[PDB]
Subunit: 310 residues, 4 copies
Amino acid sequence: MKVGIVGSGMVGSATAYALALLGVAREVVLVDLDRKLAQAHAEDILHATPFAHPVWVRAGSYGDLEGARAVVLAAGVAQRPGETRLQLLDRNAQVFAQVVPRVLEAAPEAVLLVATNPVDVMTQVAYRLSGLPPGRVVGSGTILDTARFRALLAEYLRVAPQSVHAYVLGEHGDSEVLVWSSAQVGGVPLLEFAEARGRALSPEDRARIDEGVRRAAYRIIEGKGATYYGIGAGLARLVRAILTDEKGVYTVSAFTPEVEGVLEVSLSLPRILGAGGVEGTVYPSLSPEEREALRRSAEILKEAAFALGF
Amino acid sequence: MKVGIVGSGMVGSATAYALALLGVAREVVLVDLDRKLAQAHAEDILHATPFAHPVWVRAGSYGDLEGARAVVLAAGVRLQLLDRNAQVFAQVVPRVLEAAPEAVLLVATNPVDVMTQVAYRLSGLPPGRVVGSGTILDTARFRALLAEYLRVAPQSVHAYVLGEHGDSEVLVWSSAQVGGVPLLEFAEARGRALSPEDRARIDEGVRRAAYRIIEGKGATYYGIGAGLARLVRAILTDEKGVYTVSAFTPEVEGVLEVSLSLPRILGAGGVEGTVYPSLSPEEREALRRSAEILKEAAFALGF
Amino acid sequence: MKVGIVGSGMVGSATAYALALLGVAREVVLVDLDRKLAQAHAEDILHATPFAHPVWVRAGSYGDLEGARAVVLAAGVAQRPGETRLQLLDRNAQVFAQVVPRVLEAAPEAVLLVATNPVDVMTQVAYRLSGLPPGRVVGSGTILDTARFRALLAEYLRVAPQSVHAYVLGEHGDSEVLVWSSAQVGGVPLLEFAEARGRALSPEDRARIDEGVRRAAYRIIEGKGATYYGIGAGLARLVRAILTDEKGVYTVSAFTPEVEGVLEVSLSLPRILGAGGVEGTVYPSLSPEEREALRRSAEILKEAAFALGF
Amino acid sequence: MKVGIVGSGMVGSATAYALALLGVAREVVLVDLDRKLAQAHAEDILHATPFAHPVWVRAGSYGDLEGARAVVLAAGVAQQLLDRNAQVFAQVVPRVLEAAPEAVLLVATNPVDVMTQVAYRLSGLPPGRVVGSGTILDTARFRALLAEYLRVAPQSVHAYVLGEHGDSEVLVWSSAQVGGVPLLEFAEARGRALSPEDRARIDEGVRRAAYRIIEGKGATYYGIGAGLARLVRAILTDEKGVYTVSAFTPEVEGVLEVSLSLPRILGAGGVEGTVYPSLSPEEREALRRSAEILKEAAFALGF
């Protein structure tokens, strides 16, 4: 099976590196305006594959994305000195306007998996441009924050992460929501389970955890200039769900008819991911304050789509 | 790390095979009165290892269990039968713990809940240290069938089978989650409302599995072999994962000092916590009843 | 991908088990005239799968082999009281006469993987009946013995097994040829490597090791009646090689035009195994002594097959 | 087990990432002067681990290297550079062994062959304990291109690149083996004659790889990251596998006291054996000269 990746900076290349080291697919195709950036990365990574799995990583054009069952969009541009947010956004919006049609031309039946930040808006942009059903365009969304939330929760409780069920919903960013209230451990309420043991989650712990989750990206960018390793592996996992038609549940961003009163916006909710993209939503119980933080996350996101016209 | 298995019949040797194929442990020691049987299974399995993982599978004595961090008891021979097996354990358990005072005991011998209770009493260890495979195959089969019906990955399905492993085990439909939401509410949102005949169909698939396998081939071993290996992995890696395994428990639904499957946290010291699911009146009554026959079976046997 | 197995005894079922636990194919189909036996084994193994990899193991008919890319033939009958080896071979050759056309009817593109003993003659039988090119019919042959030879050499030299290249060739069994002369480690000749390692490999070490390889099957049969775990995993690896078009080198049995002058005979030589089965033979340097042992191994198989009618 | 990585740039951080995704060690510790760079890379990678294996990646000081079996030195500093880096190693090496006295030192810093010699002198350890990545990438690429050309699994191709990592490295065509048989012979059997033209194409493919990668992206790190992770794994598992890595060598073709890549057996204590292949006159002579230039470079820098 073939995976494509458009955009061969750190995020696209680390995604290819993850795909190869985990042996997710037999073929990975890097596509980038800078033909020879794509080539350098592809060849650097090919040097790694003998020490892991038989995986054919190459640089390529959109035509070489033929039969790709999933195409990662980590396209976009290197921000400029003094280039504002909204400015960079308009630029990436225009990159996608060129990327999406070309990808879908070579790989009509590919799920499009959007990585480019801000991921929720770029997801909505690629959805509108694709002219596809909304399930076929999936954004990586909050998956790393969700998993980080699970990890920190599992740690404090002393149980396996895979026993912890817990979400981060909404915008991938400042307004994301940690769903404390219907989080579970082995199928039962989490806060309550904690309590029945050593100590219930304290105010200090909750916000130490909230800060562990919420300001991770800021810490990373502050210290090294950008995040890419984390999302590389998260994208690989999603690619894996798509190629194997897993139908696992992931907090990914997609176009959603309505949420908490807000209409036609892309954001992360728990969704079932398979060979054709997201194929069902799993809406969990929310508390009134989580519900309200979500409406609010949706609206922020809706307004950012307005400013781009999508 | 070394794993021990006492009893080199089909269940024990299949566990060794699953351990080796999955690469769970670097060293696996099969111990059996019939030494030549243990050696033959060990060597057969050793020929497999170049095609999987570096795992030293061998036959040995009780003393070769020294330093083993988990030991599987698969040494099985009506409650006359159940009497013979308790006699065996009265030999096995002291000799395992002599060579390996640190080992978590993983009871596989039928009936597993009773034998888990007897292993416990004989051990003199704390209760978390003696763990019976219990209902893990049935719980997983229950999740598998539900996942298929719902068209969702089994890992998103949290459903339990609890109590006594066998005919009277309790499928806990009532509080089953999926994606963290109620099973039935999720089932409708997938356009597959669970029908009492669906519910009964699935029930049949879980409950009658072992009976079908025995009718066709005379014994079951492939499933529990892999299940025990997964359990051994949990112990060796101090996973603290949740598994519906049997352990001596102070009280279940009023019934005191009985061994049976509940959702339990499993790590390097054995089970170290219970995660008690929500039960409906029917299920609870079933469970308390299950707990009762087991309590007095153990009691008939002097345990 | 789908793999079929005909014959659901201990060899066929242990093979299904190894395929499931190692996650080799998405679907495994066991076919046995004794349907309740096939069904019992498939369902026992299906219960293992939640603890390893998603694999659909099921019992079925020849018709259910359709689209299979490899079918393991572990078909056969139990020796009766006072029946000769050669009488048994008759009855088994007859089992293959029924099996082979039915398998090919339903999965005309499958590589056939023969496991039934004596594997070399049975490979010749499968090949003649199939009507297929020689590359399509492959016997497991001596892969277990070759693997053991290497493991023993490894442990003795203190070096990783994958660094040791030693072959067991010819007829699977007492007649097999351990190729000492051209065995190499790290590319260079075994016997100095041992030297420049502070292990000389007295003639007593080679005798120890020859007994280790040659007499394993006997020891196992004497202690438990049959072997199956070893070949179950050996076969699973051959299947993986076929499904991944690996073109790896294995000492497996195939119909060979000429070996040391003996014509049209099946036995193990080093062979390249890929999606179409064996696609090349690698002939290692042989010593006068080994060459004559191989020649002689070949002509006893040639006779036995012709005497059988193949 | 714990692995240390000193130097948290792209090589050091790609290595930790490789180690994490492949699930090689349970603890990965990153050490860098720029504490925040190390912390950021570590936290970035920690976010990946839920989607691969349970691995604890973290920033730390030399003290946190306690009990590390292997420590990667990718501490080259941004640009006489030699001298510069030679000083770094004078600081780094003593600190590491203080925390991790059984630690094999794994030099990644370029030029890797001299640095491996540097690290060795300062080590005060047995020669095998200091191992430089050397030509492992080029050897693997050489095998990959040959496998591709001959239509055969890479695992079957036994071919080495030896000597100095870089433009004067030696492809050992003469004694290369596929499936145990001489290379050129196997090419025949395949009907895939290795002509001078084909060898030139393959040579360029191997020799000019890093050049091409530097030109398109500015630096190389993904490949060496996975190669180092494999070397680390060999060490942690006491594999005793054969790798073309750089190590201090008493004499090579008559040149004395020089560090360069030869096939070496790699285990828990570092390299514990050298496997010297047959060399054509051309190759032997090219290797001899390379070794000269290195032993000189080693001596002139003060090692």
